[PDB]
Design a protein around this ligand. Sequence first.
Ligand SMILES: N=C(N)NCCS[C@@H](CC(=O)O)C(=O)O
Ligand SMILES: [Zn+2]
Length: 375
Amino acid sequence: MQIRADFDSGNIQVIDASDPRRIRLAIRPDLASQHFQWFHFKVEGMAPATEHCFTLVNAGQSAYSHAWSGYQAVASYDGERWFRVPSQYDADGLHFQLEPEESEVRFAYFEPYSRERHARLVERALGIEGVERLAVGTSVQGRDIELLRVRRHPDSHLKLWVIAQQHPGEHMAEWFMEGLIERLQRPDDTEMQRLLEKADLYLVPNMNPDGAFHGNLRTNAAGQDLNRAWLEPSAERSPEVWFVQQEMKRHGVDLFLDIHGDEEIPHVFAAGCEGNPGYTPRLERLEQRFREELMARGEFQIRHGYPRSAPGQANLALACNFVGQTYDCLAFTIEMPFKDHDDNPEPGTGWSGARSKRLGQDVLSTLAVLVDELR
Ligand SMILES: N=C(N)NCCS[C@@H](CC(=O)O)C(=O)O
Ligand SMILES: [Zn+2]
């Protein structure tokens, strides 16, 4: 058989694939940083009625190695239908098995979102009523960072910002954006009519095109963790973030959602700004309102997530905290799992692109209810 990762978001190093029950592979570190966890490769020429056993030998050295426990790898014969496969984790690494029904199959850490799909999403968005490309940034390697604006009423006053995938390996993030944008196509959507009569949406489908294309997990091309560059952005080292901050300064922000994915926690959740020195009772209540309304509508919960920050101990280098404090607006880091959303088990696919898309649509419903309370 032959294994390769010479394509968009591909990531893998082949050690030995001469024995179907002893396939050995290694995950490749980011272009310019030590991080790694995301993997994506294709296998071709597999024999029929044959059990194939894979091992990612260096999983123990990954960025979040403790997150491998309970994680099931994703696979697909066509690149459209993705399914989970039996996986285990021990000192030897991550292992997964499959008796392929076809001669070729792909494996990935999560259902991938290619830049080609990104182009299609942008093309689709600009064909929707009220949608325009407000601005465009440039990544370290010269790829577009589109900023889309949804404005259907020339007298609205609120600016709701949603950006995604600052960390390239968190592909569920742009899937979330696809769901959000596709909902805008609906001819008769009363909730969106109400929301857009009072607010415009500022959307950034992908914050790290270089990292995504190169199959990176954490950093942009220059090796910078974009979500640690908000306190001191650079047009040279973190142009992706520098771009967004300039646009925010000019248009204003009344809501900010930073879409991410968490390797360890098998639950969808949101991390707020309770650690901000600028945190206020107003924001405390708004965060409560958002979580409650979203939990009542989508696959979202509150018990599991990151620990809350002690008063005034937040790291302002993170987008959620920086934007929330700089603009005194409701702000959250939305986190979807690489595993499953255990509250609603669907083992066959675990968390997926489709469920990510749905969460995006349910978030829109939540914003529609809270619009009059944002300011
Ligand atoms: N409150 C913290 N420290 N993180 C939550 C926001 S995103 C976070 C997790 C993620 O990357 O998904 C990160 O930027 O590392
Ligand atoms: Zn992230």
